[PDB]
Design a protein around this ligand. Structure first.
Ligand SMILES: [Mn+2]
Ligand SMILES: [Mn+2]
Ligand SMILES: [Mn+2]
Length: 183
């Protein structure tokens, strides 16, 4: 059993001063084994925060993120799951076959994670799982202001992943539980 935090698009401090208090209340050191961050933290402060939560922090570079030592994309292995991580503002030209061939690697995973849109999605398709954790600070994107702050915890065990989506909907924290099993 491994617990994974999936979040991103915090945009601190430029669109948000910090993670929603109600979310910080839920995140304590010593629980989570891995953090996958879709980028757009926008500062070392947040990275340092995440490192207090878990040692194994995988983050990728989002549009305009300062750090260069952040890979654009990665494939991580947790349990028996290959997990692909990319910010999601790449938006690749089809006709560029070479880049396309490289992409194969990112599509050939059990769990695909990306961000950028600040809009949460989670669903299983053809024995793969797709997650967009949305914005943990509910930061606005260029398209709209009312973004439900959300993040995801994945509990991974063997060939099963239970994904818990947390959303700050007004006053309260709502949780949907989504089960994904690989065959
Ligand atoms: Mn963003
Ligand atoms: Mn972005
Ligand atoms: Mn299944």
């Amino acid at each position: 059993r491994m617990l994974v935090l999936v979040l991103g698009d915090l945009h601190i401090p430029h669109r948000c001063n910090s993670l929603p208090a109600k979310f910080k209340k839920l995140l304590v050191p010593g629980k989570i084994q891995h953090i996958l961050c879709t980028g757009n933290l926008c500062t070392k402060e947040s990275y340092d925060y995440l490192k207090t939560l878990a040692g194994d922090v995988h983050i990728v570079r989002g549009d305009f993120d300062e750090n260069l030592n952040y890979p654009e994309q990665k494939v991580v292995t947790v349990g028996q799951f290959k997990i692909g991580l990319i910010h999601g503002h790449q938006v690749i030209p089809w006709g560029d076959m070479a880049s396309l061939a490289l992409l194969q690697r990112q599509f050939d995973v059990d769990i695909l994670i990306s961000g950028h849109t600040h809009k949460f999605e989670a669903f299983e398709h053809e024995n793969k799982f797709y997650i967009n954790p949305g914005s943990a600070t509910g930061a606005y994107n260029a398209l709209e202001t009312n973004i439900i702050p959300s993040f995801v915890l994945m509990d991974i065990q063997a060939s099963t992943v239970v994904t818990y989506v947390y959303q700050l909907i007004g006053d309260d924290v709502k949780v949907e539980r989504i089960e994904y099993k690989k065959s």
